């Protein structure tokens, strides 16, 4: 086509989706990770995660307002990944890298899994 | 903070939100523009438009499944802007620029209004 493109548009959309999440506006699901609860937008979760994409395209699960993750999932690892989904920024640290990589593998977030593997390999 | 950032994350999220729109997955509103209907996600519309942000933060309108736009709004102009919201690409042409600018002004999409004004000024 002969379209023009606004370079900062995708980043501006994601920034506003994060502002809606912070103010709890039009969040339509709560993700339960052991004792912890995280409110989010189903569309953003699906857009970022192979696991959520599979869950919310399922004809029965698409209608659930609560999703319980596997008990082995670490709430902090989930929190870091949820923040990444809404910001593009990953808070990866020596103290959380193992939990973040395990959560990214479960959530099917291949680019996160890739950077965790590389950061771990460098420390060996 | 000490975060790392994935450069293509925002663009990848927007690409997946557009794929969900094309397959009509978790769309929660229909925008009526005269005889034409457009299905979309309320969160994306709010993230892109000052008008939709005001509409869906309203305690009564947030729950509506149908929104009717002003009869002066051109369906093609709306279609071009809806495509821009989901892709960052604006199909701006001599034949549609006046309708696109008028629709962007109504929808409160200031960056689109700005490029339309500049493209019009250059043709004068």
């Amino acid at each position: 086509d002969s379209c023009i493109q606004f370079t900062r548009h995708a980043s501006d959309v994601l920034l506003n989706l994060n502002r809606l999440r912070s103010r709890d506006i039009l969040t339509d699901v709560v993700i339960v990770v052991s004792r912890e609860q995280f409110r989010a937008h189903k569309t953003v979760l699906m857009a970022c995660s192979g696991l959520f994409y599979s869950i919310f395209t399922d004809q029965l699960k698409c209608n659930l307002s609560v999703i319980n993750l596997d008990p082995e999932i670490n709430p902090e690892g989930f929190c870091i990944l949820l923040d990444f989904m809404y910001t593009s920024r990953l808070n990866l640290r020596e103290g959380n890298i193992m939990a973040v990589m395990a959560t990214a593998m479960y959530l099917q977030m291949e680019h996160v899994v890739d950077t965790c593997r590389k950061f771990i390999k460098a420390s060996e | 903070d000490s975060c790392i950032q994935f450069t293509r994350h925002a663009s990848d999220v927007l690409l997946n939100l557009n794929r969900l729109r094309s397959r009509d997955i978790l769309t929660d509103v229909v925008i009526v523009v005269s005889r034409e209907q457009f299905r979309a996600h309320k969160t994306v519309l709010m993230a892109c438009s000052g008008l939709f942000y005001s509409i869906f933060t309203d305690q009564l309108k947030c729950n509506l499944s149908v929104i009717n736009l002003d009869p002066e709004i051109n369906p093609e102009g709306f279609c071009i802007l809806l495509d821009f919201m989901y892709t960052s690409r604006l199909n701006l042409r001599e034949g549609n620029i006046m309708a696109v600018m008028a629709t962007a002004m109504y929808l409160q999409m200031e960056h689109v209004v700005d490029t339309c004004r500049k493209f019009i000024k250059a043709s004068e």
């Binding site: 379209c3 023009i4 493109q5 606004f6 370079t7 | 690409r89 604006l90 960056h111 490029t115």
Partner: peptide, 4 residues
């Protein structure tokens, strides 16, 4: 704005 750019030519993509």
């Amino acid at each position: 704005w750019v030519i993509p």
